[PDB]
Protein backbone atom coordinates (compact mmCIF):
# COMPACT_ATOMS: atom_id res chain seq x y z
CA UNK A 1 0.00 0.00 0.00
CA UNK A 2 0.57 3.77 -0.63
CA UNK A 3 -0.88 5.03 2.71
CA UNK A 4 1.71 5.48 5.07
CA UNK A 5 4.36 6.76 2.45
CA UNK A 6 1.61 9.48 1.60
CA UNK A 7 1.75 9.96 5.58
CA UNK A 8 5.32 10.41 5.63
CA UNK A 9 5.11 12.65 2.52
CA UNK A 10 2.52 15.19 4.18
CA UNK A 11 4.09 18.79 4.44
CA UNK A 12 7.27 17.17 3.96
CA UNK A 13 10.04 19.46 2.02
CA UNK A 14 12.07 17.53 -0.96
CA UNK A 15 15.67 18.58 -2.16
CA UNK A 16 17.22 17.18 -5.06
CA UNK A 17 20.75 15.35 -4.43
CA UNK A 18 23.05 14.72 -7.35
CA UNK A 19 25.89 11.78 -6.87
CA UNK A 20 28.97 11.53 -9.52
CA UNK A 21 29.08 8.20 -8.98
CA UNK A 22 27.23 4.90 -8.06
CA UNK A 23 29.66 3.97 -5.74
CA UNK A 24 28.53 6.98 -3.06
CA UNK A 25 24.73 6.26 -3.35
CA UNK A 26 25.39 2.59 -2.44
CA UNK A 27 27.36 3.80 1.03
CA UNK A 28 24.39 5.60 1.26
CA UNK A 29 22.16 2.61 1.05
CA UNK A 30 24.22 0.44 2.95
CA UNK A 31 25.04 3.23 5.95
CA UNK A 32 22.19 5.46 6.22
CA UNK A 33 24.11 8.67 5.76
CA UNK A 34 24.76 11.00 3.78
CA UNK A 35 27.15 14.23 3.34
CA UNK A 36 27.43 17.38 1.33
CA UNK A 37 29.64 20.48 0.61
CA UNK A 38 28.79 23.24 3.73
CA UNK A 39 26.15 25.35 1.10
CA UNK A 40 24.05 22.75 1.03
CA UNK A 41 24.70 21.35 4.78
CA UNK A 42 23.36 24.42 6.00
CA UNK A 43 19.97 24.57 3.98
CA UNK A 44 19.25 20.84 5.04
CA UNK A 45 19.71 21.79 8.91
CA UNK A 46 17.59 24.53 8.34
CA UNK A 47 15.02 22.22 6.57
CA UNK A 48 14.86 19.70 9.04
CA UNK A 49 14.27 22.12 11.88
CA UNK A 50 11.52 23.55 10.03
CA UNK A 51 9.67 20.40 8.80
CA UNK A 52 8.09 16.89 9.61
CA UNK A 53 10.04 15.13 7.53
CA UNK A 54 13.02 16.29 5.05
CA UNK A 55 13.40 13.99 1.80
CA UNK A 56 16.29 13.37 -0.18
CA UNK A 57 15.95 12.32 -3.54
CA UNK A 58 19.12 10.86 -5.24
CA UNK A 59 20.41 10.95 -8.72
CA UNK A 60 23.73 9.34 -10.20
CA UNK A 61 25.00 11.97 -12.88
CA UNK A 62 24.61 10.64 -16.35
CA UNK A 63 22.80 7.26 -14.97
CA UNK A 64 19.08 9.15 -16.69
CA UNK A 65 17.61 7.42 -13.15
CA UNK A 66 16.96 8.78 -9.76
CA UNK A 67 18.06 6.11 -7.37
CA UNK A 68 15.86 6.30 -4.49
CA UNK A 69 15.13 8.21 -1.74
CA UNK A 70 15.50 8.77 1.80
CA UNK A 71 14.22 10.75 4.86
CA UNK A 72 16.80 12.45 7.19
CA UNK A 73 16.69 11.76 10.75
CA UNK A 74 19.29 13.74 12.15
CA UNK A 75 20.84 17.52 11.57
CA UNK A 76 24.79 16.86 10.14
CA UNK A 77 27.26 16.07 13.10
CA UNK A 78 30.92 16.00 12.77
CA UNK A 79 33.57 13.32 14.84
CA UNK A 80 31.65 9.94 13.31
CA UNK A 81 33.00 6.84 11.56
CA UNK A 82 35.00 8.00 8.29
CA UNK A 83 32.84 6.97 5.49
CA UNK A 84 35.18 6.32 2.43
CA UNK A 85 33.39 8.68 -0.41
CA UNK A 86 34.88 8.66 -3.71
CA UNK A 87 35.42 11.81 -4.15
CA UNK A 88 35.79 13.27 -7.72
CA UNK A 89 38.77 16.61 -0.68
CA UNK A 90 37.22 15.37 2.49
CA UNK A 91 37.74 18.34 4.48
CA UNK A 92 35.70 20.26 2.17
CA UNK A 93 32.65 18.32 3.02
CA UNK A 94 30.30 19.21 5.58
CA UNK A 95 28.77 16.81 8.79
CA UNK A 96 27.26 13.43 8.15
CA UNK A 97 23.45 13.60 8.29
CA UNK A 98 22.22 10.36 9.36
CA UNK A 99 18.76 8.99 6.86
CA UNK A 100 16.32 6.72 6.81
CA UNK A 101 15.45 5.10 3.30
CA UNK A 102 11.94 5.15 2.09
CA UNK A 103 12.51 3.48 -1.11
CA UNK A 104 15.76 1.45 -2.59
CA UNK A 105 14.51 1.17 -6.04
CA UNK A 106 15.32 2.98 -9.56
CA UNK A 107 13.15 5.43 -11.15
CA UNK A 108 14.03 6.43 -15.03
CA UNK A 109 14.09 9.89 -15.86
CA UNK A 110 11.25 9.04 -18.91
CA UNK A 111 8.63 8.33 -15.77
CA UNK A 112 8.70 11.40 -14.41
CA UNK A 113 9.07 13.81 -17.62
CA UNK A 114 5.29 15.18 -16.92
CA UNK A 115 6.16 16.58 -13.06
CA UNK A 116 8.23 20.48 -13.55
CA UNK A 117 9.79 22.46 -10.33
CA UNK A 118 8.45 25.56 -9.95
CA UNK A 119 11.57 26.16 -7.80
CA UNK A 120 13.71 25.58 -11.17
CA UNK A 121 11.43 27.76 -13.71
CA UNK A 122 8.81 24.94 -14.14
CA UNK A 123 12.13 22.53 -15.96
CA UNK A 124 11.59 19.28 -15.51
CA UNK A 125 12.22 17.81 -11.81
CA UNK A 126 15.25 15.54 -12.66
CA UNK A 127 17.11 19.19 -13.88
CA UNK A 128 18.80 20.78 -11.19
CA UNK A 129 21.95 21.04 -9.09
CA UNK A 130 22.69 19.02 -6.54
CA UNK A 131 20.63 20.17 -3.04
CA UNK A 132 17.73 22.10 -5.66
CA UNK A 133 14.61 22.10 -3.45
CA UNK A 134 11.52 20.50 -5.00
CA UNK A 135 8.17 22.15 -4.47
CA UNK A 136 5.92 19.94 -2.23
CA UNK A 137 3.27 18.85 -5.41
CA UNK A 138 6.10 18.14 -7.40
CA UNK A 139 8.32 16.33 -4.63
CA UNK A 140 4.86 14.18 -3.69
CA UNK A 141 4.39 12.81 -6.91
CA UNK A 142 7.68 11.76 -7.71
CA UNK A 143 8.21 9.88 -4.95
CA UNK A 144 4.84 8.26 -5.27
CA UNK A 145 6.04 7.53 -9.16
CA UNK A 146 8.94 5.08 -7.64
CA UNK A 147 8.20 1.34 -7.76
CA UNK A 148 6.82 0.44 -4.52
CA UNK A 149 9.96 -1.08 -2.06
CA UNK A 150 8.50 -4.04 0.07
CA UNK A 151 11.61 -4.20 1.79
CA UNK A 152 10.85 -0.97 4.18
CA UNK A 153 8.77 -1.10 6.57
CA UNK A 154 7.49 2.68 7.17
CA UNK A 155 5.90 1.91 10.73
CA UNK A 156 9.70 2.84 12.46
CA UNK A 157 10.00 5.96 10.12
CA UNK A 158 6.39 7.10 11.48
CA UNK A 159 7.34 7.22 14.84
CA UNK A 160 10.70 9.48 13.97
CA UNK A 161 8.22 12.30 12.81
Known amino acids: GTSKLKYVLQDARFFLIKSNNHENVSLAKAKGV ?7 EKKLNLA ?19 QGFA ?7 HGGSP ?3 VLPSAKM ?13 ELPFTKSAHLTNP ?8 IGRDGQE ?7 QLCLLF ?10 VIHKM
Do not use: M
Open 134 to 140: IELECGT
Open 93 to 105: LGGVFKIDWICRR
Open 119 to 126: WNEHKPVK
Open 34 to 40: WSTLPVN
Open 71 to 77: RLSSESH
Open 147 to 156: PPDESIDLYQ
Open 83 to 85: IHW
Open 48 to 66: FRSARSVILIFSVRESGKF
